[PDB]
Amino acid sequence: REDIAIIGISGRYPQAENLQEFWKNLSEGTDCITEIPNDRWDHSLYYDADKDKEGKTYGKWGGFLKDVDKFDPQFFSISPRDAKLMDPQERLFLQCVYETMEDAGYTRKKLTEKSGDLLGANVGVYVGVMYEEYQLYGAEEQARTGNPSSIANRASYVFGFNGPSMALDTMCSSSLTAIHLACQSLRNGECEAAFAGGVNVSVHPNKYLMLGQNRFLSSKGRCESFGEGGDGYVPGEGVGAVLLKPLSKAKADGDHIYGLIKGTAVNHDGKTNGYSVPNPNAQAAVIKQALKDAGTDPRAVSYIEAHGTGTSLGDPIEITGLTKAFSEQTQQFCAIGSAKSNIGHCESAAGIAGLTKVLLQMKHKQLAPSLHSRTLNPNIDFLATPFKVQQTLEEWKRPVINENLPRTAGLSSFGAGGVNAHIVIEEYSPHPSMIVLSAKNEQRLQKRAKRLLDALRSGRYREADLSRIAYTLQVGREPMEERLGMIVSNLRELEEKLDEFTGGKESIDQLYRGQQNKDTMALFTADEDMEKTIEAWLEKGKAAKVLELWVKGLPLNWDKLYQMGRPQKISLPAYPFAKDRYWI
Amino acid sequence: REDIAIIGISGRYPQAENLQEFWKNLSEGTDCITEIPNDRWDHSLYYDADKDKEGKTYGKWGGFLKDVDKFDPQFFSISPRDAKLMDPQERLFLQCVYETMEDAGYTRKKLTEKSNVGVYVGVMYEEYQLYGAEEKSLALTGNPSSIANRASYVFGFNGPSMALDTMCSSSLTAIHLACQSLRNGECEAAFAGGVNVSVHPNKYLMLGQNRFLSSKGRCESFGEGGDGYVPGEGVGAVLLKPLSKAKADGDHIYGLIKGTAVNHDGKTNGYSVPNPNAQAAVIKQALKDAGTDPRAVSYIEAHGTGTSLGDPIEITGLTKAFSEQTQDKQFCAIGSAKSNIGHCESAAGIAGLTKVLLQMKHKQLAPSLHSRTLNPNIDFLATPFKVQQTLEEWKRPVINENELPRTAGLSSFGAGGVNAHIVIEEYSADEDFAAPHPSMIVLSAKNEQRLQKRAKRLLDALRSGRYREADLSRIAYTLQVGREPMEERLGMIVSNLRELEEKLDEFTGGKESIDQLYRGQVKQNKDTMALFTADEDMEKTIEAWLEKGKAAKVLELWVKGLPLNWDKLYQMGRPQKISLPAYPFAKDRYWID
Structure with missing residues (x-):
């Protein structure tokens, strides 16, 4: 039992x-x-x-x-x-x-x-x-x-x-x-x-x-x-x-x-x-x-x-x-x-x-x-x-x-x-981090941010679990067609970004966005050496330079972010859905 | 497992x-x-x-x-x-x-x-x-x-x-x-x-x-x-x-x-x-x-x-x-x-x-x-x-x-x-048990005209033989303990499979109170239920009725509604069940008005 x-x-x-x-x-x-x-x-x-x-x-x-x-x-x-x-x-x-x-x-x-x-x-x-x-x-x-x-x-x-x-x-x-x-x-x-x-x-x-x-x-x-x-x-x-x-x-x-x-x-x-x-x-x-x-x-x-x-x-x-x-x-x-x-x-x-x-x-x-x-x-x-x-x-x-x-x-x-x-x-009893997020088309992108914003507005989590939030959005969210990520170490630099998407489409060097280009999928996957370069990218940990490649689609094995243990999950807002009527 | x-x-x-x-x-x-x-x-x-x-x-x-x-x-x-x-x-x-x-x-x-x-x-x-x-309705x-x-x-x-x-x-x-x-x-x-x-x-x-x-x-x-x-x-x-x-x-x-x-x-x-x-x-x-x-x-x-x-x-x-x-082929x-x-x-x-x-x-x-x-x-x-x-x-x-x-x-x-x-x-019958000479075929129903069929369906099975003489005690045993004691009733005495049919055809046939037919109702005889159940001595009489095993005399009392504990002495090993025809149902129509 x-x-x-x-x-x-x-x-x-x-x-x-x-x-x-x-x-x-x-x-x-x-x-x-x-x-x-x-x-x-x-x-x-x-x-x-x-x-x-x-x-x-x-x-x-x-x-x-x-x-x-x-x-x-x-x-x-x-x-x-x-x-x-x-x-x-x-x-x-x-x-x-x-x-x-x-x-x-x-x-x-x-x-x-x-x-x-x-x-x-x-x-x-x-x-x-x-x-x-x-x-x-x-x-x-x-x-x-x-x-x-x-x-x-x-x-x-x-x-x-x-x-x-x-x-x-x-x-x-x-x-x-x-x-x-x-x-x-x-x-x-x-x-x-x-x-x-x-x-x-x-x-x-x-x-x-x-x-x-x-x-x-x-x-x-x-x-x-x-x-x-x-x-x-x-x-x-x-x-x-x-x-x-x-x-x-x-x-x-x-x-x-x-x-x-x-x-x-x-x-x-x-x-x-x-x-x-x-x-x-x-x-x-x-x-x-x-x-x-x-x-x-x-x-x-x-x-x-x-x-x-x-x-x-x-x-x-x-x-x-x-x-x-x-x-x-x-x-x-x-x-x-x-x-x-x-x-x-x-x-x-x-x-x-x-x-x-x-x-x-x-x-x-x-x-x-x-x-x-x-x-x-x-x-x-x-x-x-x-x-x-x-x-x-x-x-x-x-x-x-x-x-x-x-x-x-x-x-x-x-x-x-x-x-x-x-x-x-x-009931049951620092490093920069990658906040990656994804969707299927244009307009469901800064709702998916908007809903993550309105959570962090109310302050449902504190600074202590930043690595947990990142980890979730990487491995336990689907890598959909349209994409976006950001770099943080932070309390405050979370919201400094999210409000800028709601405010406009303005580009400070804090945004990375992409989709698309299929030269690379077949180049990247079926090879042992380029996986050693993604392995060697984690060794240094220079952040922004990889996230350019993620948004263009680089599929990557995320489990190599690891201290000798991967931090546990967290409750984040699920994908908000479209509003098209069907009846009769 | x-x-x-x-x-x-x-x-x-x-x-x-x-x-x-x-x-x-x-x-x-x-x-x-x-x-x-x-x-x-x-x-x-x-x-x-x-x-x-x-x-x-x-x-x-x-x-x-x-x-x-x-x-x-x-x-x-x-x-x-x-x-x-x-x-x-x-x-x-x-x-x-x-x-x-x-x-x-x-x-x-x-x-x-x-x-x-x-x-x-x-x-x-x-x-x-x-x-x-x-x-139409919700739970209906x-x-x-x-x-x-x-x-x-x-x-x-x-x-x-x-x-x-x-x-x-x-x-x-x-x-x-x-x-x-x-x-x-x-x-x-x-x-x-x-x-x-x-x-x-x-x-x-x-x-x-x-x-x-x-x-x-x-x-x-x-x-x-x-x-x-x-x-x-x-x-x-x-x-x-x-x-x-x-x-x-x-x-x-x-x-x-x-x-x-x-x-x-x-x-x-x-x-x-x-x-x-x-x-x-x-x-x-x-x-x-x-x-x-x-x-x-x-x-x-x-x-x-x-x-x-x-x-x-x-x-x-x-x-x-x-x-x-x-x-393989x-x-x-x-x-x-x-x-x-x-x-x-x-x-x-x-x-x-x-x-x-x-x-x-x-x-x-x-x-x-x-x-x-x-x-x-x-x-x-x-x-x-x-x-x-x-x-x-x-x-x-x-x-x-x-095998x-x-x-x-x-x-x-x-x-x-x-x-x-x-x-x-499939299960195999694994090897390598006395009812007395006569056995009690008891049968029951809720009203008059269904007893004409309950037998008829048991007849038509025995007509096309289902099986032989060897399991007579088995057939009886089933109809006693593993069938409901309903309001209207009937039983019979047998020692063979041949005197089974000589009775059943007589019910389906013209009028006959010739062979030992026994028929009665629970609805008629009040004040034997309360007399029988809440007492130790009369249970010793049903116990003492098995000792002798004279058959017909008890079956008069069953059809009159005597409830009885049919663990009768079955030698303390009771014979196993058998597939018998289930209760045939009424034919009333229910759809639309």
Whole structure:
């Protein structure tokens, strides 16, 4: 039994352009749920007062993205005329796998470096999705479509992974089952690494129809997590992805770590009284099992990212289920919160959004609030119980060894179609340098700088990790067609340059830019002596003179920058994407 | 290392009411693909030749069932009004899980013994979200997950339930994941399977725009006219558990999933292209953990896709895997189930598996149809593989150079590029037990008229002898412990296989209370349940009833509903299971209003 390290993350959630700004909304508790946009359907096309007609609901609104209908087709070697015929589900994931790629800090050449096996060394893809909405395609109009397995299968095809690719389905906890199966696929050693994730979108009113006939939603149309007005919940859209691999190799091939999936668990509810009822006895049977193989006490755990459904039946049952698990051997106080309060009920991205929240709570060392918990349903009799609802933003402290310990936190998600799953996460404890950067065309060049600027503006890193930032952009970013690099030793000389690109195209001797000229590729690669000259270029370390050749395309084996050890990775902004609409 | 034993099977495929008659069609090569029925869509409105038209399509007969549309709602405690909001995908599986239950001779009594059962089905939700459209539901046919999740809810399993998706090999991925979930020991047992149905013309529209199908509209597996393929419907299910326990709790074995493998095909030149290099990377890995030589293998149930690109690539991929060891003539047999039935888009590994297991039981090698002439790119005279033209006896390879068991591979490869290969071996009955003279054939059902059939289907089996006198105690034992004690009832006394039929014909025949018939109901006799169960002495009387073994006197009390612990004294070794006909289902229609 081996731990799994999570090295790369990304995702797109209501009122969140990137993870940076998602955390903002969680930390400043901000209701991200908003009115139905004009671009989707005729808002004013039919809606109903509470529980009356056949054809409509009291569908107030829900969590949505500005992003949804856009893609950069030609980036992935896909033609625009085939982009017309594609699923928002599939792009959003592809795009957000590729951001996870680079937030982890690994190239598409990832696959050749691991094994002399054969083409593109195995990588798993596990995503858990729903009904696509564009099958509702003019069904009166011939669609010039249908598969939930094309999501993972394109992602593997495009990037060239030789590892399992599939689309799971468990009603709510699909994302988290993927987590489970990914982790399962790693311990036994069938695959090296995995892209686990979940995707959810709200595109036809059939989603909003079906959800209202079976009364799962509230009149208010908000997520009240453990609140007093505990009536039903709203459907937030969402998409997310994470990159997983064993701790065993995460140390050697220094990789940047977000957290450790130390325990995984999943089961079904046996026969409940109704179809869509959850069984509290069944819920601890997961969580006991999550903590069994994790080998960590219930008294270690300091936070539970609950599947806060918010229904009158659902939330009390969860709390009672959580109680039974923790009451077997101890009676520290654990914090309970929900991401599902801030964003909506990711239908299939429930676990991944929660996971994302959990991991964002780890990096900034803080406990974010569960919104709409001002007053608590009288059936929350917190009855000598370890749990407590997390009202507000406070600093996260580590429990002590004295009571006779690392940060430890659980993650729940439970299907209406009874499938229950729980995951348990723990936190892991001069020279001039070459800032090289690349893209596919002209105009995406000083956005890619602009986004690196706006990070260094806010000051997310200090001077100490300059070699780390450089190293990433060299080996763990793709050497694309258009190029740019710069020379630094610095704190301040980073921004002195970046602002000059935003300011204009002006040329001080600090800029090197190029593409192109093919005399040299065949000259440079198939020869032993010119590689000794690149070896001999590092010996001296005169910087500017080589970077002229990089921007003109010199491919080079970067691993020769090395002190006797190569410094570990870092979270840098992923490639910003094009804004071309595709629909109908 | 844990082998997985496969103990129960079932499925429903084109022109196949049950597995018995599915084998018939495979053995007598039959072409099970037929013209589009009148009940579905009017197709004098969508038929063209290859055209530049708005999308009207050419690819228009395929493999279909007789009443995909029916269900027995109340059997499973589900109301008819919520069976009007229904997915054919979900019923067909439930129904076929429940047949797999009883063919593997266990029942819903699973969890009263132990103190978790896995469900893995791989589907393709297509159709009623469209039918639902200009004036269906979310957990009621708006989800593929509902398929597995109801099966677990209804029967009351506490083990993983899910709907996977890999374009073609979904069923076979389920096989893989089920088997994976058993070795590590997160779950006791699994229901692996696949379900596929063809209900809207959108399926038939999308398959024709992207030209996957043929003009002729048949499955030429490795044939000359290698053009494109057809979509056969299908549904299937199998029950899996470790060999470790399969001996101890004596269960009926069909075969052994000794090896499992799966991967993706990397970057190919096109999207829907398969990579031959990628194909042996599965099969090598299937044979790696199986620990069996390529030279042991005597049959490959191929993914015979039949396309001009697909079949040669497979053959070349298969070659590379086996060519690590030596090449020889007529070394391995290749065939397809796909030829006989259509492309079961999801159930394309489960149908193959089913064929493979049917080939094992009857010891024969069924034909690959439409292989009269072979695509010139099958240049096989330096390879081990050979296309299986006709029905011949399956022989075991030999072991004296210095019995090797029957060993056979099973392939399925996605057009969305997921590839998977499973390796199956037959179990040998290993050697080198008293019920008394009379035995209790008990049988049960939920209402009056189904008891007229439950017997009739057991009759028609014994008519065509299934087997002989020797396993009478086995047949009895099954119907006692591994069949549900339903509301309406019937039993009989026998000491031979001949007085079995002399009774069964009398039920189907004119009126007779001649031989000892015993019939009754649980519904009539109240206040014996509470009298019988909560007491130590009357259990000693049932104990003392076995001591003597006078038969007829107890069976009066069974039909009146006496629940009883049928570990009767079985000498403290109870004889193993047997394949008996599962509960025949009601014929009520459910679609549209």
